[PDB]
Design a protein around this ligand. Structure first.
Ligand SMILES: O=c1ccn([C@@H]2O[C@H](CO)[C@@H](O)[C@H]2O)c(=O)[nH]1
Ligand SMILES: O=c1ccn([C@@H]2O[C@H](CO)[C@@H](O)[C@H]2O)c(=O)[nH]1
Lengths: 432, 432
């Protein structure tokens, strides 16, 4: 009786590969009912899984569906995953950036239900840009330009879709082996040969303390070691929002700034770090140092920006947004939230900035909502900055003037100290 | 969202009475699906419940259905519950025994799926005895004779029926608060004013170590303290089968022996102990010592036996079985299992004797099977007894001669040492 599988995990014993395969296959097909799977997931929450178990679980979820074939795209396929957070524009920058030095970027994604738009929602800020190409045109564009984007249509990791939904309604999301296997299985099924992970830490991150962030990163790197997909993880800071802009059109404008070498310092450093790992793992550089140098040169010489222009134009977008960002959707109203006193920024509560952006309408809440891509916010002070009373802490971009609740949430989220504060560490450590 | 209730328990926090009531009511009615209840039960398995939580859970399960009204039966209603085990004939003896000194025994029970027949299955060994009376005749007989038996028909603790079934298929049976609340809720819903518990310990018991037996007993006594139903628990030994007979007709014959003061010593001592507590709690004696003396006198003077005769006759049975046990169903075959060597009985593996009785057909396996009430076994040596090679260790009563598997299981279950062995302790301790 299937109950034995639950009992075994409950008692702290390691499931075999055969048992993990059996339970995932039966749950996927309906042989194992949801109430047994949820008891099993709670037992995992308390007793965990070994590295061998976690890798077996990852591959059982990969095998539950289809695997995207990228063999006709020349080169190693390296993919990036972040748990993300408020202001994380890295995906918009990293594509053109690494593609400009020869790393093929075969980007597949789907419209999310998150706190901002997904990559597709954001890129659709660009007039004329649309992602409705078939797989052949996708392959062609990647081999020609080294970058393209398509909407995910494959039946990937159906077992993960099902199990993550169940976890979400049974208080079993917060389990390192379940999180690690979910994320990695999705990247492997999408055809990654190698994987770069940005694991966030701090109050704005998925894992709310550094130890947990490190354990998650380690778990995913070990999965990759065992399934033959080299994986490297950077642990980076989300104690405050990244960069300045939170939104859709606003984050595209900031990404354009960053590709020109004049973006926020934190986003620039993060994109250079993640991208150096992507370039090295893709074997388009002989070392991380060489990869970093190539990306700094591509930025300063304008090649990453030209790559972005090629990418936009190839799928219908008006690349002139790079010269004239006013062609992105513009907000009807702008408001300056003034500082109430002199001081130094000691904290920006990332979760609350995210909530403020959501209240303005920058994110999706129902499976399909239409999003006003013009709205959001641009922070002007980050942790460590000096502030004078009356100085603008943030600009609020809205489609109406009825934003008192947004003003109050943002004012409360920006914490000042009367004495100077140090910059937090951005890049904590690399796990490989 | 109901998920919060799961998360709270998962994180180790105490649910309030309101929350326990809400979750039980919603699960009972279907508002809370099985996969959330099973995640909750697994969280309880790991994090447990306080005494207040466990009492709230007990009463929420009582309130989920009907409560039997015994107010027309005069006197305090005291009920007994045992987790039971191989050879436990106490329920057959205790009824007539305590009724003979004025304790009203309003016995309600239903046919079980256990390793022997239930009380009703066993009593139906008596020719003509049937339990098909309505509640009025039941009340009348208890007030006249101080004892009667009826088949449970009330919709009692539907929430417990549902949750125990779920626990059985999710590896969440083995949880002290869940076990304690299940047992006590059933006894409270049946109308007990006071409760005597026989919590077994040892390899033949529900709790497989003494510490756990003691924790379960303590948990149930505390429930009773908080819900206003005085509860006392005896921890007793099931390291070996109780008494000699395992079966149906065979255990009735042994119960008759015990009521005459010539039964097995262990069963006599257990019935005197449990019954003294029942008599005292029913306020039919001023102290446990007086209660014990009254029961010893009732046995030696033949009054408990006459009470059994009244009980049998009042519901159709041929009371002459008390003088002539051959009127109970007789087995077609008897086999003596001889000892293979000289020695001393060091162990009788209770679970395996139970399995042997089941193989002979003494128990039910499908919801409704017809049971041959004649079959089973009579042990002739208990732990501590001296044995000679060739002496009968047990008599096997069967309806065919094809019992090689029974012989082998019983031979392996009776363990001999070459040097003398002490009698185990029968009564470990009383919790109140
Ligand atoms: O079990 C998990 C947890 C997180 N995520 C990823 O992490 C994001 C949240 O940090 C999600 O939207 C998803 O992309 C998963 O895929 N699976
Ligand atoms: O959760 C539980 C566990 C045990 N029991 C009782 O204990 C017996 C097994 O020891 C069962 O048949 C039943 O009567 C319950 O009622 N509920």
């Amino acid at each position: 009786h299937h109950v034995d599988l639950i009992a075994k995990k409950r008692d702290g014993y390691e499931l075999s590969k055969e048992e993990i395969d059996f339970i995932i296959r039966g749950y996927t097909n309906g042989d194992i009912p949801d109430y047994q799977m949820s008891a099993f997931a709670m037992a995992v929450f308390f007793r965990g899984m070994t590295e061998e178990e976690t890798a077996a679980l990852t591959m059982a979820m990969v095998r539950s569906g289809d695997v995207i074939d990228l063999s006709k795209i020349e080169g190693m396929k390296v993919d990036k995953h972040s748990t993300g957070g408020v202001g994380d524009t890295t995906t918009l920058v990293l594509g053109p950036l690494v593609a400009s030095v020869g790393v093929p970027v075969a980007k597949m994604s789907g419209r999310g239900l998150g706190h901002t738009g997904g990559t597709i929602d954001k890129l659709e800020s660009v007039p004329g840009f649309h992602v409705e190409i078939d797989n052949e045109q996708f392959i062609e564009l990647v081999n020609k330009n080294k970058i393209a984007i398509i909407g995910q249509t494959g039946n990937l990791t159906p077992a993960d879709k099902k199990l993550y939904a169940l976890r979400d309604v049974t208080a079993t999301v917060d389990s390192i082996p379940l999180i690690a296997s979910s994320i990695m299985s999705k990247k492997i099924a999408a055809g990654a040969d190698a994987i770069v992970l940005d694991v966030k830490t701090g109050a704005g991150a998925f894992m709310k303390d550094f130890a947990g962030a490190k354990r998650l990163a380690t778990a995913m790197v070990e999965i990759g070691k065992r399934v033959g997909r080299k994986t490297m993880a950077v642990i980076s800071d989300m104690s405050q929002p990244l960069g300045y802009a939170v939104g859709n059109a606003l984050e595209v404008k900031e990404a354009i700034d960053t590709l020109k070498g004049k973006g926020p310092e934190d986003l620039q450093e993060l994109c250079l770090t993640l991208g150096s790992y992507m370039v090295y793992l893709a074997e388009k550089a002989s070392s991380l140092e060489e990869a970093r140098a190539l990306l700094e040169a591509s930025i300063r010489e304008g090649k990453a920006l030209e790559t972005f222009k090629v990418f936009l134009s190839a799928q219908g977008g008006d690349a002139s947004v790079v010269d004239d960002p006013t062609k992105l959707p513009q907000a009807k109203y702008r408001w300056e939230l003034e500082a109430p006193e002199d001081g130094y920024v000691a904290e920006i509560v990332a979760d609350e900035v995210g909530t403020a952006a959501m209240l303005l309408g920058a994110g999706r809440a129902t499976k399909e909502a239409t999003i006003d891509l013009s709205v959001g916010l641009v922070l002007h002070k980050k942790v460590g900055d000096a502030v004078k009373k009356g100085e603008s802490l943030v600009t609020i971009y809205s489609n109406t003037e009825n934003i008192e609740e947004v003003k109050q949430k943002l004012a409360k989220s920006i914490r000042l100290s009367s004495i100077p504060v140090a910059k937090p560490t951005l890049i904590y450590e690399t796990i490989s």
